[PDB]
Design a protein around this ligand. Structure first.
Ligand SMILES: [Zn+2]
Ligand SMILES: [Zn+2]
Length: 174
């Protein structure tokens, strides 16, 4: 009964990292267009692209909130089924899922950091120019890729382990 449940959580997990993966691309490829429009110095076009990006963050950041909960969901059920069953493999999964939240919340800190910086950049256009705007975009473009570094590794790292968890569980089942 219960192993099919644990499976569904492990599938849903992948489907969530599947949707972040997608958002991560769009947010980066949107930032391309910002560097283009700001280089031309178009006042009208920039306003749209800034709102376009600010919206994309809310969606990405939405999903980034879910995963920490959904990896907890798993942990709950694995810990349950270890008090009763004590299978050697359910232990190994639990240990992965524990270290998956470690991975996440380290990179979710780096995410908050950057969401501030973007908002400061958007507020510099409101009230004059707080610095050469060139400098703040220059800072963002780098800190963007600093997140992208932590993401693609400590993101796909999980997707490897999560796929391994499914195969393990499917094996125990028929
Ligand atoms: Zn996990
Ligand atoms: Zn897992």
């Amino acid at each position: 009964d219960y192993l099919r449940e644990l499976l569904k959580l492990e599938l849903q997990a992948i489907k969530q990292y599947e949707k972040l993966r997608q958002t991560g691309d769009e947010l980066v490829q949107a930032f391309q267009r910002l560097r283009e429009i700001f280089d031309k110095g178009d006042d009208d076009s920039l306003e749209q692209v800034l709102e376009e990006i600010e919206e994309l963050i809310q969606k990405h950041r939405q999903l980034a909130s879910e995963l920490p909960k959904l990896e907890l969901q798993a942990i709950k059920q694995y810990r349950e089924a270890l008090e009763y069953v004590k299978l050697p493999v359910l232990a190994k999964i639990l240990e992965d899922e524990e270290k998956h939240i470690e991975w996440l919340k380290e990179a979710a800190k780096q995410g908050d950091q950057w969401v501030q910086l973007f908002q400061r950049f958007r507020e510099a256009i409101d009230k004059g120019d707080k610095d050469s705007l060139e400098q703040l975009l220059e800072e963002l473009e780098q800190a963007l890729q600093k997140i992208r570094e932590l993401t693609e590794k400590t993101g796909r790292k999980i997707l490897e382990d999560e796929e391994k968890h499914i195969e393990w569980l499917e094996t125990i089942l028929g």
